[PDB]
Amino acid sequence: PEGLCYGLFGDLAFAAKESALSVFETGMRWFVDTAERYALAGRPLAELCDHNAKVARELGRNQVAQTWTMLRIIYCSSRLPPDFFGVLVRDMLHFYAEQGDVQMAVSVLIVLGERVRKDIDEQTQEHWYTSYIDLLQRFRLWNVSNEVVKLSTSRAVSCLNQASTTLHVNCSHCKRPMSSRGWVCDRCHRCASMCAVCHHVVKGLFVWCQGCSHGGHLQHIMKWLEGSSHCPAGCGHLCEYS
Amino acid sequence: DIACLLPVHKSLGELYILNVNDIQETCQKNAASALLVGRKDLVQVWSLATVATDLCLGPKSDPDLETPWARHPFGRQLLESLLAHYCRLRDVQTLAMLCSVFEAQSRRERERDQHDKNKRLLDPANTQQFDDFKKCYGEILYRWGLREKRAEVLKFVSCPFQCAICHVAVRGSSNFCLTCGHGGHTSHMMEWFRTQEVCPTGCGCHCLLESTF
Amino acid sequence: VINTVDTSHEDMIHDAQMDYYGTRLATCSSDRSVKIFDVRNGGQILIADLRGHEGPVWQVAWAHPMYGNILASCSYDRKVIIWREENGTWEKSHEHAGHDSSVNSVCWAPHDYGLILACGSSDGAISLLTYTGEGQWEVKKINNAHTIGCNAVSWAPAVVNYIKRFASGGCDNLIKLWKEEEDGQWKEEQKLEAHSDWVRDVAWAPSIGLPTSTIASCSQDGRVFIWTCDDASSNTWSPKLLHKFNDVVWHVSWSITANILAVSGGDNKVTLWKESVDGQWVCIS
Amino acid sequence: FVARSIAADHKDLIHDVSFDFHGRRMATCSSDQSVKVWDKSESGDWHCTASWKTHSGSVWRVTWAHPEFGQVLASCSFDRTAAVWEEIVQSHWVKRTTLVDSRTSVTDVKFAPKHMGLMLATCSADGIVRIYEAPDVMNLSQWSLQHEISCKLSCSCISWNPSSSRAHSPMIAVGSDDSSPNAMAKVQIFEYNENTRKYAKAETLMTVTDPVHDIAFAPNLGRSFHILAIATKDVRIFTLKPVRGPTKFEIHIVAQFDNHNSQVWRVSWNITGTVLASSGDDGCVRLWKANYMDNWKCTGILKG
Ligand SMILES: [Zn+2]
Ligand SMILES: [Zn+2]
Ligand SMILES: [Zn+2]
Ligand SMILES: [Zn+2]
Ligand SMILES: [Zn+2]
Numbered sequence A: 001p002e003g004l005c006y007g008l009f010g011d012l013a014f015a016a017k018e019s020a021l022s023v024f025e026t027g028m029r030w031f032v033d034t035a036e037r038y039a040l041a042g043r044p045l046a047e048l049c050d051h052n053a054k055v056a057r058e059l060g061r062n063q064v065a066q067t068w069t070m071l072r073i074i075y076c077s078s079r080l081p082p083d084f085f086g087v088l089v090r091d092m093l094h095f096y097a098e099q100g101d102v103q104m105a106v107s108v109l110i111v112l113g114e115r116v117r118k119d120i121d122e123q124t125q126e127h128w129y130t131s132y133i134d135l136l137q138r139f140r141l142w143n144v145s146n147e148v149v150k151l152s153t154s155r156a157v158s159c160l161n162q163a164s165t166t167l168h169v170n171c172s173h174c175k176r177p178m179s180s181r182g183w184v185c186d187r188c189h190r191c192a193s194m195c196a197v198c199h200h201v202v203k204g205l206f207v208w209c210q211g212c213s214h215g216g217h218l219q220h221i222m223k224w225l226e227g228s229s230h231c232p233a234g235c236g237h238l239c240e241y242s
Numbered sequence B: 001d002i003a004c005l006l007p008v009h010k011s012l013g014e015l016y017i018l019n020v021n022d023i024q025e026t027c028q029k030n031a032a033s034a035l036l037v038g039r040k041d042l043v044q045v046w047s048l049a050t051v052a053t054d055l056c057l058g059p060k061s062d063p064d065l066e067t068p069w070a071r072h073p074f075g076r077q078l079l080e081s082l083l084a085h086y087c088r089l090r091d092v093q094t095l096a097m098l099c100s101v102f103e104a105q106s107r108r109e110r111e112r113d114q115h116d117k118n119k120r121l122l123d124p125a126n127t128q129q130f131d132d133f134k135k136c137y138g139e140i141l142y143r144w145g146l147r148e149k150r151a152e153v154l155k156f157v158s159c160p161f162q163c164a165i166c167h168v169a170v171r172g173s174s175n176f177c178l179t180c181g182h183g184g185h186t187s188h189m190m191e192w193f194r195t196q197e198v199c200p201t202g203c204g205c206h207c208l209l210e211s212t213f
Numbered sequence C: 001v002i003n004t005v006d007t008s009h010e011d012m013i014h015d016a017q018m019d020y021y022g023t024r025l026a027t028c029s030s031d032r033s034v035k036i037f038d039v040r041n042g043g044q045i046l047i048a049d050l051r052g053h054e055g056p057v058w059q060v061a062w063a064h065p066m067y068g069n070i071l072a073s074c075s076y077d078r079k080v081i082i083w084r085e086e087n088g089t090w091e092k093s094h095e096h097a098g099h100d101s102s103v104n105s106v107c108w109a110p111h112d113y114g115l116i117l118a119c120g121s122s123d124g125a126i127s128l129l130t131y132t133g134e135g136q137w138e139v140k141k142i143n144n145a146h147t148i149g150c151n152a153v154s155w156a157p158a159v160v161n162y163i164k165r166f167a168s169g170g171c172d173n174l175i176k177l178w179k180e181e182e183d184g185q186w187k188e189e190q191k192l193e194a195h196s197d198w199v200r201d202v203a204w205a206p207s208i209g210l211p212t213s214t215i216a217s218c219s220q221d222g223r224v225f226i227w228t229c230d231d232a233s234s235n236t237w238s239p240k241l242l243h244k245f246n247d248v249v250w251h252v253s254w255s256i257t258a259n260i261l262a263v264s265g266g267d268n269k270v271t272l273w274k275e276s277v278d279g280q281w282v283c284i285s
Numbered sequence D: 001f002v003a004r005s006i007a008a009d010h011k012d013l014i015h016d017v018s019f020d021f022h023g024r025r026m027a028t029c030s031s032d033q034s035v036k037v038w039d040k041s042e043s044g045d046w047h048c049t050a051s052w053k054t055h056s057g058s059v060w061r062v063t064w065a066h067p068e069f070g071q072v073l074a075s076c077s078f079d080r081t082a083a084v085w086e087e088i089v090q091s092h093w094v095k096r097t098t099l100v101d102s103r104t105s106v107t108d109v110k111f112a113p114k115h116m117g118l119m120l121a122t123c124s125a126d127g128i129v130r131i132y133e134a135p136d137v138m139n140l141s142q143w144s145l146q147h148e149i150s151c152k153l154s155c156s157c158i159s160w161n162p163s164s165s166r167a168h169s170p171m172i173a174v175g176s177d178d179s180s181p182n183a184m185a186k187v188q189i190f191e192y193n194e195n196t197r198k199y200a201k202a203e204t205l206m207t208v209t210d211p212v213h214d215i216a217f218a219p220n221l222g223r224s225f226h227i228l229a230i231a232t233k234d235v236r237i238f239t240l241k242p243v244r245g246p247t248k249f250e251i252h253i254v255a256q257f258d259n260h261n262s263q264v265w266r267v268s269w270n271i272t273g274t275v276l277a278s279s280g281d282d283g284c285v286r287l288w289k290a291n292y293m294d295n296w297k298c299t300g301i302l303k304g
C-alpha cells in the first residue's frame, strides 16, 4: 500500500496507507555549479587545472581542488620517469568514477586528453561519458553536455551529436532543395534567406515558424515576437499564440 | 670526493628545514632548495607534498562524513609509490624527508579504529621502516656534521635551585659547577663567565677551569 | 676533487681508513707503525705515529665519535692494540693478546650495540672486546670460529631489544654468520658456502631501513658475491656472482647508502660497482 | 529533510509514485483506476495537470519513459493489461497500446533504459515476465513482444539494470512475493545474451527466501559492479561483481537492515545510486548510505 521514489533534485515522494501524498524535499547543487563553471578546453593545461581547482575550492571540495593542482604539477611541469604517475592518474579516475563522481573523471579525461586517454579503455571511457551526459541532461544543462560531447575523447560519444541534426531547406518560390552551404536559391536566383524583419540576408542563424513558413534572424524574430504576436512577414498568423 | 655518486646531497641536507608548525612553508623551501641544487624530481615531489599536505585536508573523526585523503589515490598510494621509487634509488634523504613531512601532519569502536588507521597518509603498519629511514638519515647528517639537522629530523620519529647571579628561581636550562655547586640560568653564566673567571657567588671556584673539562 | 696523501711509511700500506666525521685519516703499513693524519681542507698534518706492534699491521678501524676518538689496530704479532686520544695526543690505551695467530681484521660494532670490537685471527678464534666503562675490557672469545683461520669480520647494522649479528669470513672457503643468545653466548646460526678459495673479506651492507640484508664477500680465487636476504624471517641468503676477477680480490667496501661497492683486488686495481635496474652489478669505474 | 504534504484527492490508496526523467513531473496511480500527472511550477507547488481513468481494476505501477520518446507513461493494473499513455498538446493524454498478452494480473511495469531504445518489461502473477519493444519510436501504437520469460514464481517486482556501459549485457531482475512454506529463492536475475538473442537466468539469489515486494538496481553511474536493493521483511543490498553464456557474478550481501521491524514494501535509489530509501509497514522512510568502508548506514528517518 506504499509508494516511494526520489526525484532528481533530492526530493522524495512517499505515499503510504492513511493515502497521503507527501514529498520529502531536501543536494546536487554542487554538481550543477561544478558542471557550469569548469573550463575544459581553449586554455593551456596549467590554466585549466588552476581554474578547476579554484572552482572546487570555492565550492568547498578541497580534495577535488588538490587533485586538480596535483594533475597540473604532474603533467604541466635526473627527473622522474615519464610515465611514473600514469597508473596513479588512472586509479584516481577510477576512484572518482566508482563513487558516482563521474563528473570529475570526465572533466579530468577531457582536460588531460591524450595524456591519459590511451591508458583508460574505450568501453569504460564511453560509460563515464554517457553517465555524465545523462546527469547533465537530467539537470537540463544542455550547454555543458554538448561541450562534453564536442570535447569527448571517444569517437562514439563525439558521433552522438551528428545524428540527424542536419536540416534540408528548400526555396518556397521554387519548391526545390537548396545548396548545403548556400544563402541564395539555385533556380529562382532569389535571396530566399531574407529576414522577415530587417529584409537582409540571413547567412547564419535562421529561426523558422512551422505554421506560416516564415522567419528570419534569431534575434530579430525574438524581439518581434516579444513586441507582437503576429508574423513579421505579415501572413495573418499568430505564430506564438498569446 | 664521490658526493655525486651517492643519491644524497650534503648541500640539500644543509638547505632542508623541518618545521612541525608549518608544513607548506617547509615544503616550499625544500622545493626551492632542490631547484637550487638541480634535482627536478625532488622539485616535483616537494611540490606534490606541498599540495598533498595542506591543512584543509585533515581527516574527520567520523568516518561517515567524507572519504579521507589517505584513501584517495593521490594520498597513501602516491606516498607509497614515491617511497618505493626512492627506495629503489636508495635515497635515504628524500625518504626521511617525506616520512617526516607526512608524519608532522598526522601530529562502532572497531570501525572508528579502522578509520583512524585508514586516514593516515603514512601506513601505520610500516612505522618501523619510516623510523629506520629517519634514524639512518640522522646518522648521515651526524656524519656530515649537522647535529642540529640530525636532531631536527629525529624529532619526527614515533618511537623515542636559584641563580647565583639574578637570584631568581631556575627551572629551565641551567649550568651548575661540579667543583663548587653554584649556578643558575644558562644565559646568566654565559654573560658572567665571558668576563669574570670565579664563581659569581664569591666562593672563589675557578668554575671555567674546573668544570669545562 | 682529489686529496693525495703521502703516507711517509717505510713499507707498503695495508689499510687506510678515515674517521667517522671524515676529517682524520689513519693508515697502517708493514713498518710496524700506524700514522693518523689530518686531511681537513686537503691538508697533511701528522697528528701521531703510533708504534706499539711487533709485527706488520693489517687493518685499522676507527670507532664511533659517540665514544670518543678511539682507533683499533690488528697486527701479525698476535696483538690487538686500541689507541684512544686524550688531551690532544694519541696514546696506547688497551692491550689485547688473546689470539695465538695473526689478527687479520677488526670491525667495531654499531654504536647502538655499545663499544664492541670484533677481532678475527688466523687461528680460527674470534674475540669481542666489549667495553663496560672505567677502562677495562671483557673478552668473549669465539674459539674455533673457523677451521683454518678467520680472515675478516663485519658487523650487521642495528635492526629492530637488540639482536647482535656479525659476519665472519675464514680460510675454510666459507662465510659464517654469528648471533649472540639471550644469555650472551655467541652461536653460529647459518653457514654460507659458495667460494672456491679463501674468503678474504666479508663486508655487510649498511642498512637504510630497507627490509633486505646484503653481504658482499670476496675470495682468494677472485669471486665476489652479493648475499641478499629479501625476507628476514626466511633467513635464506642467495649468492649472486658480482664478477669474476682474473686475480685475487682483497677488500670490498659498501657506501653509506649501500648502493656502491668498492671492490679492490690483487691486480692493483680499484673498481666501483653499482647495481643496475636489471639486477646485474655493473662497474662504474 | 523538510516534509510537505500534497492534496492527492485520490479516491483510494496510492499504489505507486514515479518522477519523470528530469524530476520536474510526477505520476501517481491509485486503486481508483485513476492516474494523475503532477507538474510543479516556479512556486514549488505540485499541480495535478491531468487526471484520467485508465483501467478496470486497481492500477499497481506507473512508470515514465525517456523524454526523447516524448512524455510517455506506462501503467499496469489488475485487469491483466499494461497500457502506454502519450501526451499530445492543452495537456491531453491518449492511450497508445493496451498490452493484453498477460493472462493474469500484471504486478509491475518498467521501461528499459534509454540505450536499449523504447523497450518495456511487464511481470505477471503467473510467473511470466514479458519484454516488449517499439521498432519505430515515432509509432507508439505498435508494440512487438520480443521475449517472454517464465520465472516459475508469482512475480511482484522487476528492475532493469540502468548501466549504460557496453561491457554490461542487458540485465533484468525479477522478485517474487509468493509466501510458500518451502524455502526457494525469491529473486531471479536474467541477462540478455547477444549470441543466443534470448534472456537467460544468469544469477539467482538463494539467500532471499522471504517474499519480495520491491527490487531496484542501483544507478551504475561509472561503477564496474552492479548493486541490487531488495525489499523484504528486512532491507538487503547485494553487489553483483562480474568475473572476467551468461556472466557469472560474485554475489556478496553488503547490507541487511531490520530497522523497519516490519515488512518493507518499496525501495528506491537516488540519481547517483548512493542513498537508498526504504518504506516499510512502520510508515517511515529510512535513507541508507555507504561510507568509504562499504559499511551501509542510515542517514535519516523520515515520517509522514
Ligand atoms: Zn527557388
Ligand atoms: Zn533580420
Ligand atoms: Zn508568416
Ligand atoms: Zn507562423
Ligand atoms: Zn639566573
Ligand SMILES: [Zn+2]
Pocket: B177, B180, B181, B182, B199, B200, B201, B203, B204, B205
Ligand atoms: Zn661556586
Ligand SMILES: [Zn+2]
Pocket: B177, B178, B179, B180, B181, B182, B199, B205, B206, B207, B210, B211
Ligand atoms: Zn665552581
